[PDB]
Amino acid sequence: ATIGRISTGSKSLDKLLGGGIETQAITEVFGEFGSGKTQLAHTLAVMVQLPPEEGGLNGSVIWIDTENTFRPERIREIAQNRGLDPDEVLKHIYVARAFNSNHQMLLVQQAEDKIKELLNTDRPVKLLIVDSLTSHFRSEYIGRGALAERQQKLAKHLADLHRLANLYDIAVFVTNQVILAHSATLRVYLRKGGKRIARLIDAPEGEAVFSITEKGIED
Numbered sequence: 001a002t003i004g005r006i007s008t009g010s011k012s013l014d015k016l017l018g019g020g021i022e023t024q025a026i027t028e029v030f031g032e033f034g035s036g037k038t039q040l041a042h043t044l045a046v047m048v049q050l051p052p053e054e055g056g057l058n059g060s061v062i063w064i065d066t067e068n069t070f071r072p073e074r075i076r077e078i079a080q081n082r083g084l085d086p087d088e089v090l091k092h093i094y095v096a097r098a099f100n101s102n103h104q105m106l107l108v109q110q111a112e113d114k115i116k117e118l119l120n121t122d123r124p125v126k127l128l129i130v131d132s133l134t135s136h137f138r139s140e141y142i143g144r145g146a147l148a149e150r151q152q153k154l155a156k157h158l159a160d161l162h163r164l165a166n167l168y169d170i171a172v173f174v175t176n177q178v179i180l181a182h183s184a185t186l187r188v189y190l191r192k193g194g195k196r197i198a199r200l201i202d203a204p205e206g207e208a209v210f211s212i213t214e215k216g217i218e219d
Helices: 011-016 035-047 072-080 086-091 101-118 135-140 146-168
Strands: 025-031 060-065 093-098 125-131 169-177 186-192 197-202 209-213 216-218
Touching: 011 197, 011 209, 025 035, 025 146, 035 060, 035 072, 035 125, 035 169, 035 216, 060 101, 072 086, 086 093, 093 101, 101 125, 101 135, 101 146, 125 146, 135 146, 169 216
Parallel strands: 025 169, 025 186, 060 093, 060 125, 125 169
Antiparallel strands: 186 197, 197 209, 209 216
16 A cells, blocks of 8 residues: 655644655654653644645544543644544544553554454544553563563564554554664654754754644644
8 A cells, every 4th residue: 555644733844754754654753751742642643634635644543542641632622723623533533541561562452453443434543653652661671681671572562563554554653752772664853942843863864843832733
């Protein structure tokens, strides 16, 4: 299948990304606490629901929330301010809270069932968010021996995610609060300037700049 691209809501960030985040890929955003990673996730969860000519993929969203940071009210605000019905937008976001890293891994398997269920509806899954990708792995795999073990478990989790992205034409978007290997397709470093600034890592070589607004994010 030909890939799709989901606009972020920011023209600046979209250019940095070549149009938006890609389906059949894992995009990792990483940066310190408060950089805006979860804001970007909320914005994408709305943008993907737009029709293709408006930068969306008429898609549903699966959201694996590991830090209890999903906020329906924020979805409502973003949807309303972009001309969309808040309750309809929320209906197409399927959220599961991951209790620990093992549960988080199982939730990826369960996600495949929902992806199959919606595959031939008018709104197939087009975005799968994991926020935070790494928080449970950080708290559980710690101390001598943990670097190898944690990295192996993460890699396998990411391989499961890559398979869903590639098999079912989905954009996977993951967040990571920050010498280690990484297996995401594209890594985006995000930092706070009221501006937020994004740079592609190990990959346009410039930087994108955007604001957090009532529309999610925008230039």
